[PDB]
Design an enzyme around this catalytic site. Structure first.
Site, short mmCIF file in Angstrom:
data_model
loop_
_atom_site.label_atom_id
_atom_site.label_comp_id
_atom_site.label_asym_id
_atom_site.label_seq_id
_atom_site.Cartn_x
_atom_site.Cartn_y
_atom_site.Cartn_z
N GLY I 29 0.79 -1.23 0.00
CA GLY I 29 0.00 0.00 0.00
C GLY I 29 0.82 1.28 0.00
N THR I 30 0.13 2.41 -0.07
CA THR I 30 0.78 3.73 -0.11
C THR I 30 1.27 4.13 1.29
OG1 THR I 30 -1.17 5.13 0.34
CG2 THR I 30 -0.83 4.42 -1.95
N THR I 31 2.14 5.13 1.34
CA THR I 31 2.77 5.53 2.60
C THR I 31 1.85 6.42 3.44
OG1 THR I 31 4.88 5.57 1.38
CG2 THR I 31 4.91 6.39 3.65
N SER I 74 -2.64 2.06 5.77
CA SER I 74 -2.06 1.61 4.50
C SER I 74 -2.42 0.15 4.27
CB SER I 74 -0.54 1.76 4.53
OG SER I 74 -0.17 3.11 4.75
#
Ligand SMILES: [Cl-]
Lengths: 244, 231, 240, 235, 241, 111, 250, 195, 243
Positions: I29-31, I74
């Site tokens: 996932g994204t930060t 995330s």
């Protein structure tokens, strides 16, 4: 999920047999032999205890022969623990009928209901079947003396003489040979003991490895008596027929 | 492979294959397009038949006077989800005398789809939805995926060959966003968008399905001779 | 509660548990139904690997559902009791609400519906039983014979057989039963039924059961000697 | 094994796809829609000559204005018909009117995906639902175990379906009379059937606004069979 | 071999899921120790805070179950906190139902019974934790009772748990062979804490700063944990002797 | 003891012509000897050219109108936007009312 | 969520064996030896206290447990399984007997109830069988003294004397040579201590051995006086000191 | 409802039951048969609350007929009476109890004896030589105490019954429109048409 | 083997492989980050702009619980929403019974026990998210990070997602350079810098920055989103530092 660990106890084989029922019957074929013989004036129940130890308390013991009511008894072949579950159900069922109709339950009605319970465990619920076969011996005023057998499938049938458990094939051939219809109780007692003596896997048949019972009209006038034999009484009846 | 038997199992790289297989059913579905300006929102859908003797599977469903969606994938799953939206829009009206915000409609669909991805016995929904609406903050377009992910957009497309229309709308963004107070032009842009996803087949009169909602327009669907204007 | 879907489709479109239940029926003892001009006769095989039986008390193969309808079967004996019980309860329930006994078609339709339900319910296996259901509708003299099977399908038959070697006895009935002229009397119908079983059975001793149903709740089971007379008569005509 | 509601890698439900194979094994059923009515016809297909064919019931009434034909595991259809009849009558009780043919079909299709780990498996039978209402006139619907239904001008289901459907593609036009449709069902059934078609192994039915849903007698169908043979020999 | 996935018997009469839950116990790589004084019961445990971004005050494996009972856990923190919440609830209900404070040994039995159920019932996994309960019981005095994933429990004169538990166990055994008594013959809890740290240092062979340790003390009518400065005060006292 | 019913007064009247129909009602709303509102409408347009009033206990009256309006909405959703005829509306309202047979809506209804 | 395991985990194999029961009996074989001997005026049950650590207080772990004032139990196999069985057994003596008849159940019937509980773990959904064999000794007015063995299957048998667990085969043979029908309670205690020494390896004293009797009524252990018919428990646990006294005249 | 009587003689049980069904100030019917045949040799008459009576009678009838088909056998009159008693004994502690009083007349074929059982709505069962429910008993019991003998014939029983109906027609306030009389003996159940 | 096919099964190591597999979904996932400050907490997250067609500022990812707690996560976004929905139910019942708003440590354990419960049975799947959350209560500021296993601790700074290591390194510098403490307004600026620096590990698609905060002095102890002038000021500070 839990699907992974499901044995699927209530399914058909490709040949149309019920796996678990077949395997339960295989289990029962290793249990001690039990014989029932129906005479014109009574019924005999005889059963062989599973390999005994000398330190076993023999008199205060019950393994094979159980009382359902005053007119009906059963011989057991299979797992004892499973049998007691079914026996208590049968005992209650008999009392329900007596409470409802004020008459003792006809033998077949009790046998049918117990067999119907067994049937259920093979069609629904996903549980293992009861690893038990019964010989029912009883009396009622419709059919008189009756012998039945039921097995894990929940199928039941009536008999003049029958065996369950170990060595039934050999036992049935011997009973088929010497049985006749005009037979009396005391003759049937002898046949039962003679058959076990020839089919036993033991060296010699003794009093401590047997349970015995009779259902006679040998009380006083038109009524039925259940006699579960004491150890000493089995010792005597074994001498009286010359087996020991 | 060994990790696609049910939705309750993660793969070693952290993927949910049953959810991905549900996503695949959308890709096989017929193309549908969504786009909006500041005053109106428009759905355009290509309908699919079984053969020349059959009807054309309806793609667009009304949810309320101010909201509705188009579908791509398993149609019965769209019927279940649209029915849920109809009830939620309805609950908001009866209890609060309030028109359900298109954003809340998205949040509710996300959470309904999610529960079917974390429990044994169930399965993911096998359909994608494009929701359009007009509420107290103007026109809206949403994209629903059965993974649970809901996304608000100016324009988009889902289904087979949807990438053509999605690229076109990405180029046309600055033009169609400023088609305010002109329904027929916003539809024309949507009909040109869905044309970038056609192969061997062209838009006919019992093939095309258009829906519109806006400032002074209730959610209404056009089929048959009413879409002949746009071919 | 135990939920497992035991009856499911396979890649080729078969429900194996239903099909394996049919194999249990194929294993069961043969049962035959033949309807005449004014009667229906149900014949049943009883295997003779069981001597020392008590025939007074042993469950009979043909069961009365009501005073005017009977049911025989092939397959698992224990399974059949459950179907018979449900049928008998529905019979009394119909009399109670409609104030009229069941038609043979209705009773058959109910039994078949039960069987079907056990093919798409969770946690249960199908019935390993096929039934022959025969009788006469209230105030009607037209004979009725129906057949059901594990899947749940049912249909009417001029004559039919089920169980082991049923394909052999069906063959016999297919060339020996004239639709234009069904067995005109009780005697003719019983004989054709006994003949058909003798193609498969063995000895005509205590192996064959025969039950005759006539209109207005007239059902009787034949004894050994009565059946043995049909066996004796058929064999003497055969030596020709 | 594996879950009953599992998706394949191609995005289809295994159990629904497998039930479609069961329907391909079923007996043929054909329906044709005209402006004078809708005709429904089926192949009876008796498994043995001793079986009394008139007891084979593969065409069925739902209401006076709606009829139904079936193909596949026909025992599965009983509870579908029971639901359909109750839905139709219940709607008449609640609204003092006839229920639309499409609304009936949608109600039946709602049962379809109610399976899983609700019933244990999908239905193994497809239905042809034919009827009339005041809004959309004469209609024919094909209801599948997937929960999907299409309206058709004409449709065949069962073992001979793909061959019969190709024939229906050529023969159907928007000006067919009821009599023309009756003959067309008989003609196409005779083509795809194994045994030779007659009044005992095939059955016709129709629904019209005026007289409602009617199953034809064996005498009436026999004359239509004779009329069909004479017309094919006449050129 | 699905007999290794759920809690059913293997052919040799073993429960592998229970055995593997025992191995999860050491996943944190932390060692704990418990001893008894005349008036008190002291429990100590290592405190390892590897990440600089962690708030060290929130990293703990010692729990105050009730006013009188404390519990240290050996095993992963999620399972540890699961056990702690249940123990707190059970101890609270006991007091409401029976009108007196739940004894340390009774709570131990109860938590052990719950653990036993997971070894017999299939749908529930065992918790990968070993729970050490400490108190000064009003009837039995200073008490240490310990629970494991098998559902086993017993009282202790003293005990240790963790990867290097055997070294600490024998060290304690050798002391009680010498002293000839069941406890630490000391008046104040301060010196019993000092004994505990001293014998952990000897057995593990490592030195400790104030942030490498965690201490819980049980006295009559209260169980409490020590601050970093309380432990530092205790470390200074050991060094100056 | 709590009494779940009240009486909000007012009266309503419906007449039908050859190609039209009227449904009238006063706008006064009362409890006991007090006026709650001089203008509180109780005759409503329910869509599909159906007008409805449920007069008596206003809380029950509003609840019924609210449920019928909602019934019209779902009739469209479930039957392809078909117009709900006045005879079908009448039958539907019967079931709305009889559904509370053992705890009735305390109103006289006219459409 | 919820227990999805509604199916049996013990099923019949093609040969007819019930696997999980067999494997449970194997667990009992690995367990520490326990025994029981029936005398004319009492019954003795005994076992070794296998300590897990010398820092553990083995007094806090009781292998021999009182079920009713006249009935006691000991086991071989899995300790935790035994502990919960004792809890359930104590409760069932009240719920299904004392609360109905106002008196404690006879030995055979309490045994019967425990057997039922163990049978159900062999058939019910989502459970394994209990991994223990029990020896239950007791007294009641109409049956006198009795001794029973209960196995994982739910089967129970009455015994004059027997042993279960690690060295049961040798211990049973030892008991056959020594048992007669005229043994007095003290003679049975002597034979119990002799039989146990064969299977014990390390220390053999009153702190490593656990032993209880079913004998005469103990009025001093009743806790109250004034009711003539209440005369005290027949179950008594022998103290550490009482065992060592008998180990000198061994 | 209202009047139901029963007399057990040497070889049969005779039941008499009033023909009137009255609601308010109107006699709605004068030919009502307040009885059900439970089995070939067992008959049950009933009186009590409207609706309840027939509903209960037919429910019992269905159960006994079900038993007969299952076992291919006829229950004894004693067995049937005990089943009925238990159903009423259950009923009395239900949310809405059956307010029905019954008489059961049967011929036991195994004993070759007639049997009459009186059971009220509470489930109070007694075997009697003669029985009655409701206000009827206040006249008939004393009458039968005087004229009844245990060895009477069926004809003598019918004359004894005529004497009871005559007394009720003289001293009872309501017009019960005569009685339907039925006999239960070794040959089953039959109705006397001219009474 | 096969130990990894079913949730709640222990491997011979003593591990639950299904949870470890859920961690892989989080790493994908994204930060997202969290910074604890003088009198509060600051949250920030990376929003990948997949297409021009995404409406800016209109796909909000940070979520509020009650009126004083913020949550960001995330991994599988739907799984995060399920966890927040439960968090809101837990917080509501606490306020219902006890009147006071739920303390942050109390709230942390509510989420922890719920996530831990999804590792106890094979009929449920573990959560596919790591969740950073916190706020202000009667005892001051608290920051937490919760993982698929149910494990959570208190943090000075926290980070998760594809750029977690980059963000962690940047967080550690702030802790070392500011022992006395960081101010709320400063922490907002730093959060922007760290998200931009952590974007190097996801640099194909460009992104949209989203920040929120709770501060006793700056937001009066309530959760608020950073918008307009304060957001653009924070973006500019970040843009200056990458060049
Ligand atoms: Cl407990």
């Amino acid at each position: 999920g839990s699907r992974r660990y499901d044995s699927r106890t209530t399914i058909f084989s490709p040949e149309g047999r019920l796996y678990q029922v077949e395997y339960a019957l295989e289990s029962i074929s290793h249990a001690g032999t039990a014989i029932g013989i129906m005479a014109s004036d009574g019924i005999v129940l005889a059963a062989e205890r599973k390999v005994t130890s000398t330190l076993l308390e023999q008199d205060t013991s019950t393994e094979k022969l159980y009382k359902l009511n005053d007119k009906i008894a059963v011989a057991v072949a299979g797992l004892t623990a499973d049998a007691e579950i079914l026996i208590n159900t049968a005992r209650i069922h008999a009392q329900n009928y007596l409470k409802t109709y004020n008459e003792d339950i006809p033998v077949e009605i009790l046998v049918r209901r117990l067999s119907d319970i067994k049937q259920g465990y093979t069609q629904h619920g996903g549980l293992r079947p009861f690893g038990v076969s019964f010989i029912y011996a009883g009396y009622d005023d419709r059919y008189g003396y009756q012998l039945y057998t039921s097995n894990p499938s929940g199928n039941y049938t009536g008999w003049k003489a029958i065996s369950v458990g170990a060595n039934t094939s050999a036992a049935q051939t011997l009973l088929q040979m010497d049985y006749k219809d005009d037979m009396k109780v005391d003759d049937a007692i002898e046949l039962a003991l003679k058959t076990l003596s020839k089919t036993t896997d033991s060296s010699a048949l003794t009093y401590d490895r047997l349970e015995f019972a009779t259902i006679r009209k040998g009380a006083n006038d038109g009524e039925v008596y259940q006699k579960i034999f004491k150890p000493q009484e089995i010792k005597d009846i074994l001498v009286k027929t010359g087996i020991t | 492979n060994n990790y696609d038997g049910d939705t309750v199992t993660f793969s070693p790289t952290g993927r949910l294959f049953q959810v991905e297989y549900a996503l695949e059913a959308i890709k096989q579905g017929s193309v549908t397009v969504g786009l909006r300006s500041n005053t109106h929102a428009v759905l355009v859908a290509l309908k699919r038949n079984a053969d020349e003797l059959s009807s054309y599977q309806k793609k667009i469903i009304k949810c309320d006077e101010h909201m509705g969606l188009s579908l791509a994938g398993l149609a019965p799953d769209a019927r279940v989800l649209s029915n849920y939206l109809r009830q939620q829009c309805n609950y908001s009206s009866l209890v609060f005398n309030r028109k359900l915000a298109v954003e809340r409609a998205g949040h509710l669909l996300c959470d309904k789809a999610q529960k079917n991805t974390q429990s044994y016995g169930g399965r993911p929904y096998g359909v994608g939805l494009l929701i359009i609406g007009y509420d107290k903050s103007g026109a809206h377009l949403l994209e629903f995926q059965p993974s649970g992910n809901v996304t608000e957009l100016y324009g988009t497309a889902i289904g087979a060959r949807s990438q053509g229309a999605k690229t076109y709308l990405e180029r046309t963004l600055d033009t169609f966003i400023k088609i305010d107070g002109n329904p027929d032009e916003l539809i024309k842009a949507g009909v040109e968008a869905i044309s970038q996803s056609l192969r061997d087949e062209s838009l006919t009169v019992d093939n095309l399905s258009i829906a519109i909602v806006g400032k002074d327009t209730p959610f209404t669907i056009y089929d048959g001779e009413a879409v002949a204007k746009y071919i | 509660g135990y939920d497992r879907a035991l009856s499911i489709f396979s890649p080729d479109g078969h429900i194996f548990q239903v099909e394996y239940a049919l194999e249990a029926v194929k294993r069961g003892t043969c049962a035959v139904g033949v309807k005449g001009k004014n009667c229906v006769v149900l014949g049943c095989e009883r295997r003779s690997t069981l001597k020392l039986q008590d025939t007074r008390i042993t469950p009979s193969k043909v069961s009365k559902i009501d005073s005017h309808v009977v049911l025989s079967f092939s397959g698992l004996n224990a399974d059949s009791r459950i179907l018979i019980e449900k049928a008998r309860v529905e019979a009394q329930s119909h009399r109670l609400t409609l104030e009229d006994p069941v038609t043979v078609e209705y009773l058959t339709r109910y039994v078949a519906g039960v069987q079907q339900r056990y093919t798409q319910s969770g946690g249960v296996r199908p019935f390993g039983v096929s039934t022959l259901i025969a009788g006469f509708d209230p105030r009607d003299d037209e004979p009725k014979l129906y057949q059901t099977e594990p899947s749940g399908i049912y249909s009417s038959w001029s004559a039919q057989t089920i169980g082991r070697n049923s394909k052999t006895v069906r063959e016999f009935l297919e060339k020996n039963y004239d639709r234009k002229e069904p067995p005109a009397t009780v005697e003719e119908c019983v004989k054709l039924t006994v003949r058909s079983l003798l193609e498969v059975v063995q000895t005509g001793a205590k192996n064959i059961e025969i039950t005759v149903v006539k209109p207005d709740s007239d059902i009787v089971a034949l004894s050994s000697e009565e059946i043995n007379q049909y066996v004796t008569q058929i064999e003497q005509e055969k030596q020709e | 094994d594996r879950g009953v509601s599992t998706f394949s890698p191609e995005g289809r439900l295994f159990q629904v796809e497998y039930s479609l194979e069961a329907i391909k094994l079923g007996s043929t059923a054909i329906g044709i829609a005209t402006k004078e009515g809708v005709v429904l016809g089926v192949e009876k297909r008796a498994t043995s000559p001793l079986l009394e064919s008139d007891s084979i019931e593969k065409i069925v009434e739902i209401d006076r204005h709606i009829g139904c034909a079936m193909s596949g595991l026909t025992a599965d259809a009983r509870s579908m018909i029971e639901h359909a009849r109750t839905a139709a009558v219940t709607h008449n009780l609640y609204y003092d009117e006839d229920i639309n043919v499409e609304s009936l079909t949608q109600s039946v299709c709602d049962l379809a995906l109610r399976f899983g780990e609700l019933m244990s498996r999908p239905f193994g039978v497809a239905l042809l639902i034919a009827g009339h209402d005041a809004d959309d006139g004469y209609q024919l619907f094909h209801a599948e175990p997937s929960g999907t239904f299409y309206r058709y001008n004409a449709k065949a289901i069962g073992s001979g379906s793909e061959g019969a459907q190709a024939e229906l593609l050529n023969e159907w036009h928007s000006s067919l009379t009821l009599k023309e449709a009756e003959l067309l069902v008989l003609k196409i059934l005779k083509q795809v059937m194994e045994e030779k078609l007659d009044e005992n192994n095939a059955q016709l039915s129709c629904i019209t606004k005026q007289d409602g849903f009617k199953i034809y007698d064996n005498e009436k169908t026999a004359e239509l069979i004779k009329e069909l043979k004479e017309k094919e020999a006449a050129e | 071999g699905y007999d290794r996935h759920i809690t059913i018997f293997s052919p040799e009469g073993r429960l592998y899921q229970v055995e593997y839950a025992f191995k999860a116990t050491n996943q944190t790589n932390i060692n704990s120790l418990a001893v008894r004084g005349k008036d008190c019961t002291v429990v100590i445990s290592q405190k390892k805070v590897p990440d600089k971004l962690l708030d060290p005050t929130t990293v703990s494996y010692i729990f105050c179950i009730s006013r009188t009972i404390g519990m240290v856990v050996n095993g992963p923190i999620p399972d540890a906190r699961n056990a702690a919440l249940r123990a707190k609830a059970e101890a609270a209900e006991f007091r409401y139902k029976y009108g007196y404070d739940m004894p340390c040994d009774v709570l131990a039995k109860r938590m052990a019974n719950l653990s036993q159920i997971y070894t017999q019932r299939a749908y529930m996994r065992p918790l990968g934790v070993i729970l050490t309960f400490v108190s000064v019981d009003e009837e039995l005095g200073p008490s240490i009772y310990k629970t494991d994933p098998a559902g086993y429990y017993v009282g202790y004169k003293a005990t240790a748990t963790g990867p290097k538990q055997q070294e600490i166990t024998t060290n304690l055994e050798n002391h009680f062979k010498k002293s000839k008594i069941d406890h630490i013959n000391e008046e104040s809890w301060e010196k019993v804490v000092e004994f505990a740290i001293t014998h952990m240092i000897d057995a593990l062979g490592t030195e400790f700063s104030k942030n490498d340790l965690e201490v819980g003390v049980a006295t009559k009518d209260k169980f409490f944990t020590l601050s970093a400065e309380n432990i530092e005060e205790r470390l200074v006292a050991i060094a100056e002797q | 003891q709590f009494n779940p019913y009240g009486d909000n007064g007012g009266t309503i009247l419906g007449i039908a012509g050859e190609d039209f129909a009227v449904l009238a009602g006063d706008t006064r709303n009362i409890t006991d000897y007090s006026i709650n509102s001089r203008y509180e409408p109780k005759v409503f347009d329910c869509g599909d050219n159906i007008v409805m009033s449920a007069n008596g206990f206003a809380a029950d009256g509003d609840a019924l109108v609210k449920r019928f309006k909602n019934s019209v909405k779902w009739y469209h959703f479930d039957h392809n936007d078909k117009k709900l005829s006045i005879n079908s509306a009448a039958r539907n309202i019967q079931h709305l009312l009889y559904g509370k047979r053992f705890f009735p809506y305390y109103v006289h209804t006219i459409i | 969520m919820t227990d999805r395991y509604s199916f049996s985990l013990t099923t019949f194999s093609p040969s007819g064996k019930l696997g999980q029961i067999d494997y449970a009996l194997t667990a009992v074989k690995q367990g520490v030896t326990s025994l029981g001997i029936k005398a004319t005026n009492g019954v003795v049950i005994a076992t070794e206290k296998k300590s897990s650590s010398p820092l553990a207080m083995s007094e806090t772990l009781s292998k021999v447990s009182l079920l009713t004032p006249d009935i006691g139990a000991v086991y071989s196999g899995m300790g935790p399984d035994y502990r919960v069985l004792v809890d359930k057994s104590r409760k069932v003596a009240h719920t299904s007997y004392k609360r109905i008849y106002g008196e404690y159940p006879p030995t055979k019937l309490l045994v019967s109830e425990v057997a039922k509980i163990m049978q159900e773990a062999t058939q019910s959904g989502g459970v394994r069988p209990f991994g223990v064999s029990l020896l239950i000794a007791g007294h009641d007015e109409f049956n006198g003294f009795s001794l029973y063995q209960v196995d994982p299957s739910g089967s129970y048998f009455p015994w004059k004397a027997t042993a279960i667990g690690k060295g049961s085969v040798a211990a049973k043979t030892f008991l056959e040579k020594r048992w007669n029908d005229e043994l007095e309670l003290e003679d049975a205690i002597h034979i119990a201590l002799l039989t146990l020494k064969e299977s014990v390896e390390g220390e053999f004293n009153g702190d490593t051995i656990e032993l209880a009797i079913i004998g005469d009524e103990n009025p001093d252990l009743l806790g109250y006086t004034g009711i003539p018919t209440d005369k005290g428990p027949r179950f008594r646990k022998l103290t550490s000191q009482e065992i060592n006294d008998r180990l000198e005249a061994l | 409802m209202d009047i139901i009587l029963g007399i057990r003689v040497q070889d049969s049980v005779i039941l008499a039951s009033s023909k009137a069904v009255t609601r308010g100030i109107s006699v709605l019917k004068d030919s009502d048969d307040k009885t059900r045949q439970l089995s070939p040799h067992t008959l049950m008459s009933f009186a009590g609350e409207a609706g309840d009576t027939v509903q209960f009678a037919e429910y019992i009838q269905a159960n006994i007929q079900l038993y007969s088909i299952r076992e291919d056998y006829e229950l004894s009159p004693q067995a049937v009476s005990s089943f009925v008693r238990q159903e009423l004994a259950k009923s009395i502690r239900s949310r809405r109890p059956y307010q029905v009083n019954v008489l059961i007349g049967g011929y036991d074929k195994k004993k070759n004896k007639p049997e009459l059982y009186q059971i009220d709505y509470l489930g109070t069962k007694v075997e009697l030589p003669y029985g009655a429910h409701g206000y009827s008993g206040f006249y008939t019991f004393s009458l039968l105490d005087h004229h009844y003998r245990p060895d009477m014939t069926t004809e003598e029983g019918l004359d004894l019954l005529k004497l009871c109906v005559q007394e009720l027609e003289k001293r009872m306030p309501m017009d019960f429109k005569g009685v339907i009389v039925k006999i239960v003996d070794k040959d089953g159940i039959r109705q006397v048409d001219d009474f | 083997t096969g130990y990894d096919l079913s949730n709640s099964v222990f491997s011979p190591d003593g591990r639950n492989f299904q949870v470890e597999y859920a961690v892989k979904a989080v790493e994908n996932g994204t930060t997202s980050i969290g910074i604890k400050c003088n009198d509060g907490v600051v949250f920030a997250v990376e929003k990948l702009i997949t297409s021009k067609l995404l409406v800016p500022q209109k796909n909000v990812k940070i979520q509020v619980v009650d009126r004083h707690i913020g949550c960001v996560y995330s991994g599988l976004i739907p799984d995060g929403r399920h966890l927040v929905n439960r968090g809101r139910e837990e917080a509501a019942s606490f306020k219902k019974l006890y009147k006071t708003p739920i303390p942050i440590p109390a709230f942390a354990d509510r989420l922890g026990q719920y996530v831990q419960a999804h590792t106890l049975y094979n009929s449920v799947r573990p959560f596919g998210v790591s969740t950073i959350f916190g706020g202000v209560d009667k005892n001051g500021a608290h920051l937490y990070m919760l993982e698929p296993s149910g494990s959570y601790w208190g943090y000075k700074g926290a980070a998760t997602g594809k750029g977690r290591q980059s963000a962690k390194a940047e967080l550690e510098k702030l802790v070392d350079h500011h022992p006395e403490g960081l101010s709320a307004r400063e922490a907002v600026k730093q959060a922007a810098k760290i998200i931009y620096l952590a974007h190097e590990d996801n640099k194909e698609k460009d992104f949209e920055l989203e920040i929120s905060w709770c501060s006793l002095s700056e937001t009066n102890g309530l959760h608020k989103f950073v918008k307009g002038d304060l957001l653009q000021e924070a973006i500019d500070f970040a843009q200056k530092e990458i060049n």
